[model samples]
Target: GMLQQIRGPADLQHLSQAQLRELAAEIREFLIHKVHLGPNLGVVELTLALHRVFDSPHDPIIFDTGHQAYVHKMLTGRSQESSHASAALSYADGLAKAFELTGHRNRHVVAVVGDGALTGGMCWEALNNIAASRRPVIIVVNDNQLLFTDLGLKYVGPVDGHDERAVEVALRSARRFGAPVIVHVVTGWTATFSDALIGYAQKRRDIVAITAAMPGPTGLTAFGQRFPDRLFDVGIAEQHAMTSAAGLAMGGLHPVVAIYSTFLNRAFDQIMMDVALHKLPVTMVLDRAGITNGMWDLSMLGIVPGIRVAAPRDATRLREELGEALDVDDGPTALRFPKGDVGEDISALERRGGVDVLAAPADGLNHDVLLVAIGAFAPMALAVAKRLHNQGIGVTVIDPRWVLPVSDGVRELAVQHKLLVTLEDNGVNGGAGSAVSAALRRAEIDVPCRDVGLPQEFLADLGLTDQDVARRITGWVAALGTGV
Candidate 1:
């Protein structure tokens, strides 16, 4: 309710302390369903405080990595921009450049930097330049976990960034200082998701959680508390996290290697050599895996032989699949999920072998196109199928649930239709689409297949929406004569 009333900073400023607290909750609710790179919950207060103290666009409040700026966007009038276009900004130098472009520091230029970004050298370089200029800039360092210090700039307390009033007061003091100030705010990453993992951890002690500094949102924090001895915090070394899991599996414990998808690239060599080579019964839980930034697509992990990759369509399926992954004691298993609240459950008509038949042909088994959708795209696929059905194109919508190994169940269903269209959130090459085509070709099931996914390039260049995907699929279906 408080969120609906907020259209801009003026409305936000008008809200009382009690109402501002409610607004924080509203922002978290809005962000729970959004696909973002940073922990939006942690920055709720910090974002509100920044907007309350400083003007945006006019003051040029820039996001360091840009992914953590969701709260800023919502406070300003650009909340809808993320849905239609890429949310990424100009990186570390973005704020400094903005100040330079304006040619004066009359207005306070602010930059929101995430803890993950401090690892990069560019941010350090930007901080130095801003400090030397003695510009009246505000740097809200979103220190979700790590404690950052001594960056040669005026520093603020590692404040509880989630507290609405606390952050607001800190920002007000920062603005009054009239110099570059680093307001370090601490936050909880994936606090809710961590709770969910706690429930799962209680069921089994053999399922040891492992992480490389991704303990909060990645679900290791709760697991650590429950099974203190069982959890392994391998620090920031991703390679050690992977290789250590292999050793743990060898020692009889079932290790769940929980790490961000981007960090997975750092441990690829160890995953291939130690885990995959030894056929360890380690479950690699790749968090934030999708076509958001195109940095760490799980398709690259497809190259690892004998590794089973699973992508769940919704929360229900995620639980089911995570349970299934734990049951596997044969080889290494990798499960990937995007960085947001899980999608709603899409009930299936029945399990067509391994694939979940979400929607059958409206024309009674006389379908022209068989639509195979991977995780996260099931809802959009169902809507697309309904649209195609209205266009006189018979369609069967199937959520494969698992993308790797190209289930035989999907290949069996493909032969029944004249054309097969695959939808996924990963890159086209070596993704679900390619796997389906390869499976069909191997089975000698001759059918025209169209791959619908983010292009091979970065998603920024080829960003997509449900409407865009539906339009492309509709055109493809239209090319085939309707059996009317």
Candidate 2:
């Protein structure tokens, strides 16, 4: 086993190119289902080359997601490790900044992450900081994709990942680079919001998109590719992304910021102070939401005055909502979507109370319960309606795609219906449900309303299956005893 040898990168410097290449083959054999068939294997050569080129622990070679360090670990003699997506650049920024501060000028920082991780908004934040700083930080992209250069950071890339010497020579040059530069090695989409953003930008010259560093996951990269000047890859920086967007809108352009829902938390102050305070036309598109702390995006954005929150019900509604959002030039609009496959369209039977009615009783059918579906929950709420119907409870379900502020139309529905429930992939407290409840009280609408969502603090966990929801709704409707 070739794996039994090296103590660290210092020892790795002694191996011949042929042996280094052969050793890479054995790490795969060692990784044989201890099974990390990802960049772990893809990065073996570059990992070897990086250790050969830069003396880590001294140079501080940082892995974006430490998980990619399987080989790096073996080479460094630990052979164990991971957590991350789009954060190494930020860490490298801090280290380089510290080095500058402490006068530890000899120790440079190296950030290793794949192009896949670069789509994070945090990365964009670091990119600009690193670019402006006269510090020596090498951002080593372990996989393929040509980025940087335009951002004013020196980019030395397109090096062969298959060859250790080529990458080593390139990296050695990067060490001598004397400034923040992108030293990349070769390698190798959520598409929903992408098509809409591009579609609108084509029509409106003022429309632009700002992502942190993630064009791939946010589906905003093509926007950058198509309209290079209009699309800004701010790189993993949510706070700056929003503030920059505020400036972009302040200048006359309409800025569309597509970011992960989880990352928006850091930008809340900027949203309220920078964007909302000015009432600029900044559109925020959130993806991979509700799976993480994104459960709070609605509540979070709702709390920011002058910003309208939209949770599109389906793929079609998402596109339609994006169009609607673009037309509003007075203030910020937030459009958020969940991650993963968007199933078939859930068409609304009609529009009422300024909401899309997904299910309603027949002409003569009475209204017993009104189910309000928010975003991804439209289908689940409709199914809950069917279960209520099977139990002889007349149900009307509405998907208020533009949910937040509890529309007058929605409050009017509560007055007409005996019971109302707001279903969302959002937090129970301060979400649209709470907004509707508050609106109902203000309107003197006496109907009882239930907020069916994760806890106020959040699900903290999942009681979140369709059957669990159906069972709860059935139990509530049963207790009402007013359903026919």
Q: Which candidate has the highest TM-score of all?
A: 2
Backbone Cα, N, C clashes tallied per candidate: 1, 17
State in Å the error of residue 476, model 1. Answer: 2.1
The sequence of per-residue lDDT tens digits that candidate 1 reaches over residues 1-484 is 9788777887777778888888877888788866553477776777788788777767667665546667877777563222211111233245555556878556666667677665533454566666676657777777761232355567777688768777888888888887767787888224444655566778876778888776876867767777788888876667778888999999988888887776676688898899989998999887777753533355777788888888877777777777888888989897777777765578999997788999987745367888898757788788877777776667789988777778878988898888899888787888778878888898888788988786675333463566666677767766876552
Residues 365-446, model 2: lDDT tens digits: 6797888888788777777767766766678888887886677668777777888888888888788788888878888887
Kindly report which residue stretches of model 1 are placed more than 4 angstroms away from their true locations once superposed: 1-200, 291-296, 459-463, 482-484
RMSD of each: 9.4, 6.8
Prediction 2 TM-score vs. true:
0.69
Candidate 2 lDDT trough over 10 residues, lowest sum? 77-86
Error of 1 at 420 (Å): 1.1
Clashing pairs in 1: 190-217
Error of 2 at 196 (Å): 3.5
**Which candidate wins on lDDT?**
2
